[PDB]
Amino acid sequence: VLSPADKTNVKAAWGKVGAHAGEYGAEALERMFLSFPTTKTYFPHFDLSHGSAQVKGHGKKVADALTNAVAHVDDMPNALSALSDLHAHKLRVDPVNFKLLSHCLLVTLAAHLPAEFTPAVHASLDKFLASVSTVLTSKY
Amino acid sequence: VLSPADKTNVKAAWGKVGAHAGEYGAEALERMFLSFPTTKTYFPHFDLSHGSAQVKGHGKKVADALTNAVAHVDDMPNALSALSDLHAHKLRVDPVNFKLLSHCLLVTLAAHLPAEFTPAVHASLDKFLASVSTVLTSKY
Amino acid sequence: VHLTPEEKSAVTALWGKVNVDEVGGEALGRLLVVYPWTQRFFESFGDLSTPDAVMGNPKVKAHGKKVLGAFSDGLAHLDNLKGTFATLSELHCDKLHVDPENFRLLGNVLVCVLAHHFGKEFTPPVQAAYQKVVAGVANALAHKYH
Amino acid sequence: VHLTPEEKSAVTALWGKVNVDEVGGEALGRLLVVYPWTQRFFESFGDLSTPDAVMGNPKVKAHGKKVLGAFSDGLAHLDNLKGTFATLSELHCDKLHVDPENFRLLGNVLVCVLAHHFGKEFTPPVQAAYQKVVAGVANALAHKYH
Ligand code: HEM
Ligand code: HEM
Ligand code: HEM
Ligand code: HEM
Numbered sequence: 001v002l003s004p005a006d007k008t009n010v011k012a013a014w015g016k017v018g019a020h021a022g023e024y025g026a027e028a029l030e031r032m033f034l035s036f037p038t039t040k041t042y043f044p045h046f047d048l049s050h051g052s053a054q055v056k057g058h059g060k061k062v063a064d065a066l067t068n069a070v071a072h073v074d075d076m077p078n079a080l081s082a083l084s085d086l087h088a089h090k091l092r093v094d095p096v097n098f099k100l101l102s103h104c105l106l107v108t109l110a111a112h113l114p115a116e117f118t119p120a121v122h123a124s125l126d127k128f129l130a131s132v133s134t135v136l137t138s139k140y
Numbered sequence: 141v142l143s144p145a146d147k148t149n150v151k152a153a154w155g156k157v158g159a160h161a162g163e164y165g166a167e168a169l170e171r172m173f174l175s176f177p178t179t180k181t182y183f184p185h186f187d188l189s190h191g192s193a194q195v196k197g198h199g200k201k202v203a204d205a206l207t208n209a210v211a212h213v214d215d216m217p218n219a220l221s222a223l224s225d226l227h228a229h230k231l232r233v234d235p236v237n238f239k240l241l242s243h244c245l246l247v248t249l250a251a252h253l254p255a256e257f258t259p260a261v262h263a264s265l266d267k268f269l270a271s272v273s274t275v276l277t278s279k280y
Numbered sequence: 281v282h283l284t285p286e287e288k289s290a291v292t293a294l295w296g297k298v299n300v301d302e303v304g305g306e307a308l309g310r311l312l313v314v315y316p317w318t319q320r321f322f323e324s325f326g327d328l329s330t331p332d333a334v335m336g337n338p339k340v341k342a343h344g345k346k347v348l349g350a351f352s353d354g355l356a357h358l359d360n361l362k363g364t365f366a367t368l369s370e371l372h373c374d375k376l377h378v379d380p381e382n383f384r385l386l387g388n389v390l391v392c393v394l395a396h397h398f399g400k401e402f403t404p405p406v407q408a409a410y411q412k413v414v415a416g417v418a419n420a421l422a423h424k425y426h
Numbered sequence: 427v428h429l430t431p432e433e434k435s436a437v438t439a440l441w442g443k444v445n446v447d448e449v450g451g452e453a454l455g456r457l458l459v460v461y462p463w464t465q466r467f468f469e470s471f472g473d474l475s476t477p478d479a480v481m482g483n484p485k486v487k488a489h490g491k492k493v494l495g496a497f498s499d500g501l502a503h504l505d506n507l508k509g510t511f512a513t514l515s516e517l518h519c520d521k522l523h524v525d526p527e528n529f530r531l532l533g534n535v536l537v538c539v540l541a542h543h544f545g546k547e548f549t550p551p552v553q554a555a556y557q558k559v560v561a562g563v564a565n566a567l568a569h570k571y572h
Binding site for chain 1: 481534539544546550
């Protein structure tokens with residue numbers, strides 16, 4: 001579970017994203033595709049050119065989905081139930097790749113939140129994205 | 141989460157351990173110490189050689205916890221709360237090590253219950269030990 | 281990876297009695313059953329809907345047979361594992377993009393299968409020898425990621 | 427571990443600007459905070475009970491400085507990381523018995539710190555170059571397990 005401090009830190013730091021959520025998703029996806037090229041094969045037909053609209057559009061949906069998960073932080077298994085079946089049953093995403101995206105979302109937040117990315121918040125965001133990752137890999 | 145099918149499978153398979161709990165528990169630790177020598181450092185106060193009475197004794201406690209967990213399958217967080225506290229806070233067991241012991245418990249069961257250790261039961265047992273391991277690292 | 285003379289002697293003695301026709305497919309079958317994301321890579325193999333289908337699948341059995349063939353090569357050339365797997369590493373890494381984590385999973389599934397078939401013979405000292413091999417094969421197959 | 431001529435320059439340019447006396451401590455600190463089980467190896471170091479204690483700890487910062495020295499010595503020997511780190515491999519593997527997975531986690535935490543201190547300047551092209559370095563340092567530190 002996530003300590004009431006962890007949730008406060010997740011709701012604090014992710015609230016500051018707000019409007020740029022769509023743009024941070026895109027950067028975290030770009031970061032993962034460049035750092036870990038094995039992940040590209042899940043997006044074979046994507047335009048992965050720097051600042052492609054298709055990646056901006058997908059970064060938008062991932063960001064929106066994480067926003068939803070902050071709002072249902074006590075109720076994630078049911079919030080992201082359709083998203084679980086998608087990643088697990090249809091897409092067959094290797095659990096390892098969730099640690100890769102989660103890490104690239106951490107790099108993106110640290111690079112955008114100088115004052116806001118303290119060790120404490122780092123630990124809370126890490127635990128948060130680990131929880132989302134556990135739910136999304138849950139229907140195996 | 142564990143399914144009705146998976147619970148049925150674990151209860152049936154773990155049921156056949158019976159009076160051999162300590163024997164199986166102790167063999168699994170020995171397999172883990174020989175195969176993954178980095179685990180030996182968590183038991184510095186033990187003779188870890190073959191035939192050790194500290195290992196046989198610890199094997200029994202480990203296997204008993206598992207019987208207990210099988211019986212509280214639908215309620216594992218509360219059943220293992222005390223054990224999670226010992227493993228996470230007091231001992232600070234690297235989560236990697238739970239995978240290593242879990243693999244050696246499957247190997248042990250595989251070698252001792254041939255007819256029981258079908259693919260479906262292998263899959264159930266692996267899921268169950270992952271669930272046990274998640275709870276035992278929950279206080280991280 | 282460095283096996284002791286006794287370890288190497290024990291490994292070979294066990295491998296001699298492996299049924300080259302079934303064990304490979306048992307390992308590959310259990311991988312697809314226990315770690316279902318691995319099915320992403322064998323959609324060409326047909327019905328993998330249920331455990332009994334996966335283990336019944338003639339293509340999983342025939343592919344398994346090739347998978348064991350490559351472990352046998354590895355056992356025969358423990359001092360040249362990187363080389364033995366050079367072609368298969370660029371296959372699995374550069375072309376298939378399998379995460380090297382799954383290499384280690386298949387290895388541990390192989391160990392379960394050997395334990396399940398040999399019972400009392402698959403002693404902890406023998407297991408320790410085999411955990412060094414499959415770790416070596418996994419590391420070798422993953423060279424193109426290094 | 428192959429960095430292209432532009433990857434080596436992007437990596438060098440950034441590293442040049444790293445505060446050699448603080449970044450190490452920041453990396454080791456966040457490892458202990460984010461991955462508490464890691465404190466098990468640093469009980470000699472005194473108070474690690476809260477973030478503030480961890481970052482404030484003079485022994486953490488003193489040790490962080492020695493870790494960043496070993497990363498600096500790796501960035502000047504990218505073509506032979508096995509030999510640069512075979513002394514430290516023995517130490518962590520045979521002496522300290524650290525599980526090699528933790529070398530990966532420290533690597534990624536250091537990538538997070540470089541991201542925190544440089545902001546927009548730590549682009550993916552630059553991150554991607556560093557992921558190859560940290561993966562390379564981890565793999566070389568772990569070699570006395572292979
Ligand atoms: C925190 C982690 C993740 C979140 C929140 C997330 C969220 C989403 C969302 C919202 C969608 C849109 C699905 C729809 O329209 O119904 C999606 C689709 C998808 N996700 Fe993820 N995802 C995550 C991790 C991953 C990872 C690690 C991979 C692969 C490495 C992945 C691969 C995909 C793919 C392939 C699609 C379908 C895209 C298409 O239409 O071709 N996801 N994800
Ligand atoms: C399914 C996994 C595991 C179970 C069910 C389990 C269960 C237990 C139990 C029942 C005890 C004794 C509790 C008591 O006497 O108060 C214990 C103690 C301990 N466990 Fe575990 N354990 C597991 C995994 C691990 C792993 C992976 C490690 C290390 C690699 C580990 C290291 C220890 C240590 C060091 C002790 C202390 C024993 C002593 O004081 O001598 N455990 N565990
Ligand atoms: C030590 C571990 C493994 C060994 C020794 C191994 C060995 C082999 C061999 C010998 C082939 C056939 C080569 C050929 O016909 O040219 C092959 C093909 C293949 N392997 Fe593996 N493999 C391993 C692990 C994995 C894993 C974990 C996956 C996926 C999760 C995987 C996916 C495949 C696929 C998709 C093919 C091609 C099958 C086809 O399209 O017909 N392998 N492997
Ligand atoms: C990239 C990863 C790492 C690098 C480059 C690294 C480097 C070093 C260096 C340079 C030293 C000093 C050796 C000496 O002065 O003789 C050291 C010591 C040590 N390292 Fe690491 N290390 C790494 C990862 C880890 C991790 C993950 C752990 C534990 C989780 C760890 C635990 C230790 C310990 C306990 C010492 C000895 C501390 C003491 O003297 O009390 N290291 N390491």
